[PDB]
Design an enzyme around this catalytic site. Sequence first.
Site, PDB file in Angstrom:
ATOM      1  CG  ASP A   1      -1.930   1.120   1.132  1.00  0.00           C
ATOM      2  OD1 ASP A   1      -3.088   1.173   0.475  1.00  0.00           O
ATOM      3  OD2 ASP A   1      -1.717   2.319   1.905  1.00  0.00           O
TER       4      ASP A   1
ATOM      5  CE1 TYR B   1       0.219   7.945   3.251  1.00  0.00           C
ATOM      6  CE2 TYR B   1       0.700   5.931   2.387  1.00  0.00           C
ATOM      7  CZ  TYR B   1      -0.191   6.757   2.785  1.00  0.00           C
ATOM      8  OH  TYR B   1      -1.570   6.162   3.380  1.00  0.00           O
TER       9      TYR B   1
ATOM     10  CE  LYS C   1      -3.910   4.183   0.429  1.00  0.00           C
ATOM     11  NZ  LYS C   1      -2.440   4.318   0.673  1.00  0.00           N
TER      12      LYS C   1
ATOM     13  CG  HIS D   1      -4.839   9.613  -0.093  1.00  0.00           C
ATOM     14  ND1 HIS D   1      -3.195   9.554   0.023  1.00  0.00           N
ATOM     15  CD2 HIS D   1      -5.024   9.068   1.204  1.00  0.00           C
ATOM     16  CE1 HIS D   1      -3.060   9.061   1.021  1.00  0.00           C
ATOM     17  NE2 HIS D   1      -4.027   8.678   2.012  1.00  0.00           N
TER      18      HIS D   1
END
Length: 316
Positions: A44, A49, A78, A111
């Site tokens: 994931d 990030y 995402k 997201h």
Amino acid sequence: MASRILLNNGAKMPILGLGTWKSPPGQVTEAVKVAIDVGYRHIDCAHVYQNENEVGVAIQEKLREQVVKREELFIVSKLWCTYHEKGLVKGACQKTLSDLKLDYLDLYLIHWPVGFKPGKEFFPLDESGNVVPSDTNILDTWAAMEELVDEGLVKAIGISNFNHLQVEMILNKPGLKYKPAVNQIECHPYLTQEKLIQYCQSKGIVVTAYSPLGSPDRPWAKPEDPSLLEDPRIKAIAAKHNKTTAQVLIRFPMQRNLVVIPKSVTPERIAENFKVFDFELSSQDMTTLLSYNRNWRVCALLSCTSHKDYPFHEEF
Ligand SMILES: NC(=O)c1ccc[n+]([C@@H]2O[C@H](COP(=O)([O-])OP(=O)(O)OC[C@H]3O[C@@H](n4cnc5c(N)ncnc54)[C@H](OP(=O)(O)O)[C@@H]3O)[C@@H](O)[C@H]2O)c1
Ligand SMILES: O=C(O)COc1cc(Cl)ccc1C(=O)NCc1cccc([N+](=O)[O-])c1
């Protein structure tokens, strides 16, 4: 139990994946390599990030090593909130593909339902700390996601942090071409999500549980805050099964027909977290864990509470 769940696009998704939020860029390449070596086939990811390049190094090395075939991996990423505009979605996906070293994603998610002003900043704020919205709505963003399927960039599309009315809004979209395959939501014994999970499952949407351990490394953790890994009640269930508390917390969503994505950069924990296919929680254990619900959320931001599409005012 079986290792994969059938999605409404006809593809199979591994029910255990590796989370990567907060995984330091100088650790995550090793983490992902270790994870693939010990059996993970689902990772994931997300652009926000800030570590997709490093995740990608690991994936590419294991493909090159022929540890795994591309068809055997299930890679998720995402679309960040500052890219909800029609004209920005493809480039956002392509940037992710470039960083991950892939030519397709297995699953690409919206997201958060909230769109923000595009620009370099992931959280554009006004002078008083409110996020600056995008006037683009979730249905136009969804149409843009659908185009990615039709261009071969993504095999499946889904949503994340959508409440049931928002899910219903897409399901009821005029001219809907692809139903969401997945809704990825926070879910653990302190936020058990019975109502949203039943809604989604009744529509054939698979639910992925994030923060299954309660995100003890979340950057906004307070002293006060409940701790799943330290809850003596859960520790007692784990002891009874001769498993760790983490392993109980991971097996719990699996038995609710959820996908689960625990994060670790610790090699021994990455391996431990995968060793959850050799034991069963009883129905009584399951109902007991469900009973610990406190409607306690890791993930929710004060800066977004006035956005038109903020998801958590609704009961579910
Ligand atoms: N869609 C969304 O909006 C959204 C939001 C939040 C999370 N997610 C996804 O869900 C993933 C998982 O959620 P999360 O990162 O918030 O938290 P989590 O998986 O609930 O918890 C991760 C924390 O648990 C520790 N840990 C892992 N395995 C352990 C074990 N066996 N024993 C003791 N501690 C252990 C990790 O430490 P070490 O790493 O130091 O080992 C880290 O501090 C994310 O990484 C991300 O991929 C998605
Ligand atoms: O979102 C995630 O996957 C995990 O949490 C992250 C991760 C990063 Cl790298 C940066 C910021 C966050 C975060 O504050 N997420 C919460 C959040 C975001 C947007 C909107 C909301 N919201 O409430 O509408 C909440």
